[PDB]
């Protein structure tokens, strides 16, 4: 049988490699995923799509099987840095026009800054489980997730993480309603399975969750893609999840106000990819189709 791992394909970005899947031909369709995950988020969903148009599933530096990178610390695997490979490795594959973005988590934090400043180039965006404020307080945070993410945001997160790798170890299954099987949760470990700085990506991340306006920059960039998100007319696509975790409450009524918006509701927490696949895809191929 042919593995995931097997079928990517890969670019030098910056002297990097970085690990992608790329299917198809025509206007790129672009699924970003994000933390701590890979391009495999994607896989039930991408066969939805299928000769729809050019599909590409990238791995951020650092996760899956792009690489990791040199001399690893705290101030690695920023919001900044993902851009810079990320930009870099979409200009390289020629995603300039006409691009579908599907986004999840940190990958709508990416999709999100990157269709706002290339607003013409975009067809679309399906968006789910995302990135959509900053949050001014603790108290705006989701109640299943704060005690976890206070302790990563302090000095406690490099042992939660580089040794105890906690946020594939916890928050994944706690995240997903189904269980994964052996399989498919080996591979979310694998990119992850050396304790240390291989899994830095993981513990960067929530540290750069804008809460009380920290970190600004992260804070700053987006407030101006959720301002311009209400205005622009690019066709949006909400997939809602039942219960959902980061777009619930009075988030999802704000997200609900934004232009040329469609919704569909399916079930999950935040890795909704794993409990409504079919859902997700027949949403994404319809919508996708209508534009
Ligand atoms: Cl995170």
């Given at each position: 049988t042919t593995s995931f791992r097997d079928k990517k394909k890969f670019a030098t970005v910056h002297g990097k490699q970085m690990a992608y899947i790329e299917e198809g031909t025509g206007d790129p369709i672009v699924f970003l995923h994000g933390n701590p995950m890979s391009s495999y988020l994607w896989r039930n969903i991408m066969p939805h799509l299928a000769g729809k148009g050019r599909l590409i599933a990238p791995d951020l530096i650092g996760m899956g099987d792009s690489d990791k990178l040199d001399n690893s610390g705290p101030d690695s695997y920023?919001?900044?840095?993902?851009?810079?490979?990320?930009?870099?490795?979409?200009?390289?594959?020629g995603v300039t026009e006409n691009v579908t973005l599907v986004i999840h988590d940190w990958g709508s934090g990416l999709g999100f800054?990157?269709?706002?400043?290339?607003?013409?180039?975009?067809?679309?965006?399906?968006?789910?489980?995302?990135?959509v404020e900053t949050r001014e307080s603790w108290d705006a945070f989701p109640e299943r997730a704060r005690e976890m993410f206070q302790a990563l945001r302090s000095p406690a997160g490099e042992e939660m993480v580089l040794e105890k790798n906690l946020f594939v170890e916890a928050l994944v299954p706690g995240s997903i309603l189904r269980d994964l099987t052996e399989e498919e949760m080996n591979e979310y470990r694998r990119p992850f399975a050396?304790?240390?700085?291989?899994?830095?990506p993981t513990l960067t991340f929530p540290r750069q969750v804008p809460i009380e306006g920290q970190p600004k920059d992260?804070?700053?960039?987006?407030?101006?893609?959720?301002?311009?998100?209400?205005?622009?007319?690019?066709?949006?696509?909400?997939?809602?999840?039942?219960?959902?975790?980061?777009?619930?409450?009075?988030?999802?009524?704000?997200?609900?106000?934004?232009?040329?918006?469609?919704?569909?509701?399916?079930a999950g927490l935040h890795f909704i990819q794993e409990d409504s696949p079919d859902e997700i895809g027949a949403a994404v191929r319809d919508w996708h189709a209508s534009l």
């Open positions: 920023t919001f900044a840095e993902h851009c810079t490979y990320l930009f870099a490795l979409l200009e390289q594959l800054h990157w269709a706002h400043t290339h607003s013409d180039a975009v067809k679309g965006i399906a968006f789910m489980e995302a990135i050396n304790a240390g700085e291989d899994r830095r992260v804070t700053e960039l987006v407030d101006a893609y959720v301002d311009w998100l209400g205005q622009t007319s690019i066709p949006k696509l909400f997939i809602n999840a039942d219960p959902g975790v980061l777009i619930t409450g009075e988030v999802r009524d704000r997200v609900r106000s934004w232009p040329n918006l469609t919704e569909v509701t399916v």
